[PDB]
Amino acid sequence: EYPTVNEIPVGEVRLYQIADGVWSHIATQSFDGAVYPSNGLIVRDGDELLLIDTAWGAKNTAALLAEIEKQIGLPVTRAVSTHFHDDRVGGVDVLRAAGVATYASPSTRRLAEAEGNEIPTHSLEGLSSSGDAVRFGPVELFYPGAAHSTDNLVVYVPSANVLYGGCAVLELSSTSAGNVADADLAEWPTSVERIQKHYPEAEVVIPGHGLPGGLDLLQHTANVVKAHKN
């Protein structure tokens, strides 16, 4: 019953409970004439919530906050963007205006600025080298190395064994790595291997787009990217 574009009209947001205090948020995007669902994460921390990634753009992200208040009824106090592309930082201004403290690595913030995208307010230090990990409220942030982008982060929820990969992880039904304009195809399989090695106890893996599954999404991702590199 994980929602797809056939269940979410363009511009709508849904939540899906993955585990106690862990949800994905799913929003249908329209981009370059294609329509597709994008995932992010919500994690409970006491009586507050941590948000991972926006819903792409001001209107979608406002709709996300509305859906969270309806379904969960706890305030979002902090948000993290997993890389600099407009789909993951677009909407940060809505978050910030709503009182959410927004975060990203310094690399993500620089790249977003240089692109003319919205820029998270706060820097996350300690994530500049492959294998680097930092605790942030109820999650661990991990920099696996360059993959979909050079700055991409993944997020682990230790209490629930849930890994959110952002666009560095592909769904099982995927046959291509998607937009690779800012990707490092040579490094990406190695970066996935770091994730595999560091989180061998992950039970649920959530890709940037599409259906969650188990740890096999990681090996599948490496395989697709390697086959792409042809």
Residues near Zn ion, by CB under 5 A: 85, 167
Piece of 65-73, 84-92, 146-154, 211-219 that binds Na ion (CB under 5 A)? 84-92
Instruction: Provide, rounded to whole angstroms, the least separation between the CB of residue 218 and Zn ion.
Output: 18
Q: Which is nearer to Zn ion, 34 or 200 (CB)?
A: 34
Q: Out of 85, 88, 148, 220, point to the residue binding Na ion (CB under 5 A).
A: 85
From Zn ion, Na ion, none, interface partner of 199 (C-beta below 5 to 8 A by class): none
Residue 25 annotated as part of some ligand binding site: no
Three-class SS state of 66: helix
By CB under 5 A, what part of segment 146-175 binds Na ion?
A: none
Instruction: Take residue 53 and report the two structure tokens written for it.
Output: 């990634």
Instruction: Provide, rounded to whole angstroms, the least separation between the CB of residue 178 and Zn ion.
Output: 8
Name the catalytic one among 148, 151, 152, 220.
148
Distance between CA atoms of residues 112 and 121, nearest Å: 12
The residue assigned the tokens 């992010």 is: 40
Q: Where are the alpha helices (DSSP H) in the chain?
A: 58-71, 86-89, 92-97, 106-115, 188-198, 216-228
Q: What is the DSSP string of 5-23?
A: TTTS-TT-EEEEEEETTEE
> Binding of Na ion at residue 132 (CB under 5 A)?
no
Is 198 known to be catalytic?
no
From Na ion, Zn ion, none, interface partner of 167 (C-beta below 5 to 8 A by class): Zn ion
The residue assigned the tokens 């890709």 is: 207
Name the catalytic one among 25, 53, 60, 85.
85
Distance between CA atoms of residues 126 and 103, nearest Å: 13
Cβ 92 vs Cβ 118: under 8 Å: yes
Helices 188-198 and 216-228 pack at an angle, to 10 degrees, of 170
> Binding of Na ion at residue 29 (CB under 5 A)?
yes
Is 32 known to be catalytic?
no
Question: Which residues are catalytic, by number?
Answer: 83, 85, 87, 148, 179
Q: Which residues are annotated as a binding site for Zn(2+)?
A: 83, 85, 87, 148, 167, 209
